[PDB]
Amino acid sequence: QNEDEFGDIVVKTAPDGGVTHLRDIARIELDASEYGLRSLLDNKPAVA
Amino acid sequence: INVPQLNVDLDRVKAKQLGVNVTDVFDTMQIYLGSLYVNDFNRFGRVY
Amino acid sequence: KVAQRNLTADDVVRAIREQNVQVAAGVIGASPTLPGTPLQLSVNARGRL
Numbered sequence A: 001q002n003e004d005e006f007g008d009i010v011v012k013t014a015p016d017g018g019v020t021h022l023r024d025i026a027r028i029e030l031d032a033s034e035y036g037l038r039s040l041l042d043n044k045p046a047v048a
Numbered sequence B: 001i002n003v004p005q006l007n008v009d010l011d012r013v014k015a016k017q018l019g020v021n022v023t024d025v026f027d028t029m030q031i032y033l034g035s036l037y038v039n040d041f042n043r044f045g046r047v048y
Numbered sequence C: 001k002v003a004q005r006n007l008t009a010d011d012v013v014r015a016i017r018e019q020n021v022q023v024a025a026g027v028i029g030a031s032p033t034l035p036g037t038p039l040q041l042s043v044n045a046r047g048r049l
Helices: A003-007 B012-017 B022-034 C009-019
Strands: A010-013 A019-021
Touching: A010 B012, A019 B012, B012 B022
Parallel strands: none
Antiparallel strands: A010 A019
């Protein structure tokens, strides 16, 4: 549901018992699905 | 919203340290309790 | 010949699917990018035979 749960993802489990989490290797943020276009209205953030 | 049900909580860290895949837990629950559909078989020329 | 090399037809089919395939090679400097990045460059890589 959120960024921190996505950080908890186990990308590698060490043989002794040790867990490497997704936050260890990446930054997890909520954002846009693509970035090709921007929209301003009089130089303030907007959507048409 | 007050029909009786069951909640099943899966310990993710305990699963991955114990060597069990979280998709494997969910797959067991689904197949055993939820009746997965696998593929079709033919009977009297009809697909079932 | 394929058996002589200890291969089944599935092996060769996997090889063709693996080596005859388009590539999504990426883009350098695309949004979002840290400031000062001057250019947005697409990457090419010969993938299809």
